[PDB]
Design a protein around this ligand. Structure first.
Ligand SMILES: [Cl-]
Ligand SMILES: [Cl-]
Ligand SMILES: [Cl-]
Ligand SMILES: [Cl-]
Ligand SMILES: [Cl-]
Ligand SMILES: [Cl-]
Ligand SMILES: [Cl-]
Ligand SMILES: [Cl-]
Ligand SMILES: [Cl-]
Ligand SMILES: [Cl-]
Ligand SMILES: [Cl-]
Ligand SMILES: [Cl-]
Lengths: 318, 320, 318, 318, 320, 317
């Protein structure tokens, strides 16, 4: 689906000015505090699955707004402690909790939890819908950072790490966060808001450089924002919307990541445009690496899977 | 586009068996009771608009789950009482509250309120999201009739009539409910749950004959249900989902409509398939009429607009 | 969606060199004279419509080439004089004469006439077809300014104003011309050829900057010209065609507009490209204003409708 | 691609009831009389073309409504008399008069004239546009058989035969009419209105069984009629339109064809649906044959080209 | 994206007449003999991969026409014997030998070999191209059963089983063949031509009921045959082509399958139409089961993966 | 609509050659392997409904002992006749393009429409070394010796040698023509053989591969992209372009000494304007490029006139 974004030479140098508001840090500090006021009260229930050498469970826990978050948790059937992984799924891309992939990760030796994103693949979302918005989750409660959809999601991700880390069979010093697109963004955001994860792997991360994204993306779901503005023409609404988005934009959160990070990008990706991903990457100040794949788009990239397994193995499995 | 559904001869005879559960009526009785428990507490605020002979306001009121419902209210700038209309908009199809259309309806002589559907064109939705569902509103809280998205919406529509009818400038005996697709469904559902409206006009109503809809529709949003089942393969989930949907299906509510009704359908409509619309119409037991337009689909039908205006004029503007 | 034309900064500065031939003014002078030679002989016939407070009629009149032009005429049912509007419809976009919209305009207080464009939404076209051309009206009689399709149409628009102006219930000093795309072009052209209209409102006007339009448009109907050249490869035909088109191009007519003008443009419009619209606007020397809508294309723009009503009310109604 | 119309078994049996009005025959009698009142006054002008053994000319002649019809005429450069062909082109499908194909036919030994259809590939159309209609020629003057676009076209086709037949280098006893789609229809109509042609070859003929066509076609140009009804919703207009169309429908004209006829049809044709073509074929009462091609649609069918050449050679050349 | 083939009720009874020629059996007997004349001469080379508990190798062996067939072979890093699987990939759908999937199967406890199909994902194809054909492999050498593309492929599949079965770490009595679409067809054909495999799992098998397939498929690659006939209009060519295809059609080979079989089909599959898959299934005379998924097409079906794993576990991993 | 470089830039676009040091040695050795195979041509009359032309089915042996075929049409009159070898487009040959071949003969040319290995006809004995993407573009791409077009190019040269040996043919008046894939074969043949007198190529394919894979929007150049997606090893991409360079028109154009006529449509999405200008700008001979603003990868009427005039001027006389 041929090249369309900036040239590779330009992408390497693309580093848009941060859009973080003066109260950026304070907002997350207060948000994390509201999260801490909710007792995790996790629950585990065995779940049958046709596989040998792995025990699967359905895990739930309380998070921001007293929402019950869920997901499958697969553990190598042998004496631990085990290195662990918190896997985040893509936007509206979760089928049956992605249980088959979770189990396979456990077979690779990792205690794995696939957190289901509020209202998408699973999990409850107690946050109210303040008013009208475009079809989808991208603009729900977008007129305020306190009501925005991803506020709860980001906090759920952090809480997921706190719950996994507390498990006896888990080695709290060998926990990684992974995911693609929406999942990549959650991995990066979690690593930025918590020092629990040791490493981060993000395939073409979403939710990055919003202001350029709405002008370059050619496919959903970034365009849900454009749809929102078409339905609410008030100029002040557009201004306020981008103000809200800035608190969740990866270009403003990347700076907080201290963990070794591995990213991937396909140069013909029309969903998460190369420029938006390079933007996030170029704002990272840590041991990092970005794998660029000329002939791939927003999809599973075989060559990167090898890089990913090698990276996780090096930093966690040992 | 182009014919694809049942032949016209078959459509006229298409009347699927009701799917209403034994507790169908009980469910709506209890739902209306929960609505009654919430005080309307309506509010009006003047809203500037470049038009002569019409006063526009932003109207809000409390509804099911203590949700603040909103919408524009336009009134003919003259001594009343005035006949009134509650207009419902299409699925994810509301731009700036559809104020221009609301104003024009008022210019036609109707005190008009365009209720904004929860989370779509406006209005607050306090109902929580019980769990995962497909992109969109169609499957939100679908695993239970108590949590389903349209429960609140239907009640908001009923409450809209109760608020409008209480206005002194409004003639409670000349109120009509209108809308297209999602709007047509809300108009029919409101008239089925309330005897406040005198007449109903619904352009190719949505939310009808769900079990056939998911197998015949070729475009969104009925297909959101198909998407939901793809993401939740548990067979019991599909069973449960259709159980929930039956409580809101027009083929089960149509029987309660006693008001004169006018409907429209384009034979090449791929969003609200002709068969699903005929299904709703054929379940109506009242003074009714269905205008069939061979060359149109899910869109504005000029010829029908004339039928609509004539119908509302005869029952509301020039009556009583 | 997505942007594709010149950047907004460039659009504001885009002002292509006029393409008007030295006999430009003489051609229109002669054309207006041929028009004058035809007696209007207008006729009115009451037309029933389910609306209170407005009387509707079917209006007809003779124009260039002795063609019978038609359209619906709606009048506020109250003592006048009334401010008036001549509304022009879009290319092949007239359904049942657009009667519903005409009636609504009258309900807003304007004596309104919706002129039907020759052979499209209605009206007779006595102009002969000189020879072959591409499917559509864009290239009919394009090998000569005297035979070109829009010659008659532009003249009909002028004659429409002369007929409306003569009505007793109409206040000749408060007449406006409005329309979108093809309609916007007719409104501008009529205001350029006649001083009868007081104001002009044109939504993304068509028939502007032809030479750039054929190289930037991505949808019909500008592309009908490209289709024409594909079917008639003689190089002299292309030269001749653009020569003809120049006599009707808004960039050459805009300079004659003296009335206050309001225009609109969506930055993702693929039918009437932003650059072609800015070109027409930038050639206007009058009290003007161009509303730019980032998220809209060739469609009804709600926010602009408010601007439009406000503008018409300020100059005509109040 | 794929099948979509009636099964082959049903197609062979499909023979819709004629829709010809009681004055069908009288209408064409009167039309042919109005044509006779116009002097052909043909003109020939040498036209240079890079080919040896063939002389090319630009031919023009007067027809119905005093319209100047044109087209290229190629003649084998050798002593005649020569068998001849009048080739009709497809709807809006004529490029540079189809000169290359005309010359090739001459190289095959046929004095060939490629009549250009009014306003399409060439030729003048003096018939006025009575009123509004949909984009295209299909609905021009459709509210009356006297004003309908194809009335002049059909007569031009007949006049083409009268002109060619009069040429000294042409053997009036060996003239054939050929064409595809619109061209096939003109060939059949011409053979139905004139006994000049000896044989007929029509590739998937258009303008056949209109009432079924508007309900089965999936592509232009039959759908222009549907577009017309969308823009003019009056029920009486639909009734009137089909009334007019019946006078030009091949299912009503086929019965007059006495010449040997060869037809072709691709079972996945979405422009001229199989059922509409079988309809025309099944209404023919003459030496006929229909070649059915399962894997082809509205396009050049190689296998049929061989059938065509053999057929013309058998009846004309040899 | 929506129902289009026969109704479910009709699909269950769809069983087209076999098209096998009188020399069907003799052709395969002769072909297997030509294969036997080629010494396998397999080779193994360790291949590094970032995984713990599994050893991966690049495997090659000689097959029909002395073609060198290749593929990745992953083995559980523990004392055997191990149950084994021969996995076949989809049409032009092999990326880097599908190594990641092969390794995962080994992690599930199966010695797995992912045979690469001639000229597609890998492996050499020594068979000559007799003449012109349409873009793709579907019509290569189609004018003769001896030259047809899939003759070598089917034999390679059989030889794959003979090679895997000879490995000491492999339990010859617990070998399964799996694959989707083209892979499903290869699995079924292999099980039909060899009694080495114990069980078969085929996701919406391709190469089935060719004569119906070319008239119902809406996407590639069945349509490559239609393309072929467009380019070679001789009627005798079409007749000859279908004669050749009959020797490889699953509806003619299914009858030879004696192993327990598990199949899947999505009702909206446009590539391998439901009718063509039901046809293959209904021609099977063995312990069988067909999983039908209403909302899925030609894609990975989550729910079926669970069925597959349970099935293989029951017959291979947890048995003997 | 326009999408490639501007016309002004296209006229100046001349990418650096990618030919390897052994470029000429490779073709010299390949032509020698071809010479090793005896043509042993055969002719069989073929019935066709046309007067004044005799049609035959011609076959001959070529590289790898592959039997190449095609229709051969001859003006039914005393020769010698000027001749043409016509090459068809990628996967675009229907029934050998017999109708077009016959028409060329009616124009006065003894014409042979060579069918490209495995496409419109002809046998391809070259083995498939390993996996490749759907299509012929990447068959045997990991080596210049095994690449699909090696045999095809040699078949084209052999076609000229066979036609030239016919008594009814005037060896000094032979032209090579074709569009896209056919244009490339015409140019390649004229580059590898001095037999043809003139060349006419409509928007030639197989040119400037490295830019083609980044600019083309439709098949079949994109088959290469598909290949890389299925074989991600970086060394494979490097090797693949190494192989392709031996067949790229920008490296072969320099050998063409015959008068050449080319055409290009500015909205061509299959053979992008830049790749065609690239080939043209690498030609050092009597040449001319016809540019058609409103056309793409299709039959261009105006160019057909240029083509006939050009062939008539240089051959027919
Ligand atoms: Cl909000
Ligand atoms: Cl993508
Ligand atoms: Cl739910
Ligand atoms: Cl629709
Ligand atoms: Cl003209
Ligand atoms: Cl647009
Ligand atoms: Cl008319
Ligand atoms: Cl077609
Ligand atoms: Cl073959
Ligand atoms: Cl599918
Ligand atoms: Cl290779
Ligand atoms: Cl193209």
């Amino acid at each position: 689906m041929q090249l369309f974004d900036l040239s590779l030479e330009e992408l390497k140098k693309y580093k848009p000015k941060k859009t973080a508001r003066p109260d950026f840090s304070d907002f997350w500090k207060k948000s994390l505090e509201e999260l801490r006021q909710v007792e995790a009260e996790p629950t585990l229930e065995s779940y049958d699955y046709p596989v040998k050498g792995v025990k699967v469970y359905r895990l739930t826990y309380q998070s921001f707004g007293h929402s019950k978050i869920e997901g499958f948790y697969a553990v190598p059937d042998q004496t631990g402690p085990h290195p662990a992984l918190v896997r985040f799924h893509g936007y509206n891309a979760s089928y049956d909790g992605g249980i088959h992939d979770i189990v396979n990760w456990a077979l690779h030796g990792y205690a794995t939890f696939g957190m289901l994103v509020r209202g998408q693949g699973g999990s409850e979302d107690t946050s109210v819908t303040p008013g009208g918005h475009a079809l989808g989750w991208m603009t729900k409660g977008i007129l305020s950072k306190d009501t925005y959809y991803y506020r709860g999601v980001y906090l759920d991700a952090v809480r997921a790490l706190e719950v996994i880390q507390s498990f006896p069979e888990v080695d709290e010093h060998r926990i990684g966060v992974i995911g693609g697109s929406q999942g990549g963004a959650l991995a990066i955001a979690a690593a930025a808001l918590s020092d629990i994860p040791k490493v981060v792997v993000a395939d073409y991360p979403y939710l990055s450089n919003f202001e350029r994204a709405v002008d370059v993306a050619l496919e959903q779901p970034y365009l849900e924002i454009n749809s929102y503005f078409r339905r609410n023409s008030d100029p002040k609404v557009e201004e306020k919307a981008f103000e809200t988005l800035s608190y969740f934009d990866l270009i403003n959160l990347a700076g907080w990541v201290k963990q070794p990070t591995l990213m991937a990008i396909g140069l013909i990706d029309k969903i998460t445009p190369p420029s938006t991903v390079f933007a996030a990457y170029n704002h990272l100040e840590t041991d990092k690496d970005l794998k660029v794949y000329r002939y791939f788009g927003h999809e599973f990239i075989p060559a990167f899977q090898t890089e990913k397994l090698s990276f996780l193995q090096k930093h966690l499995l040992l």
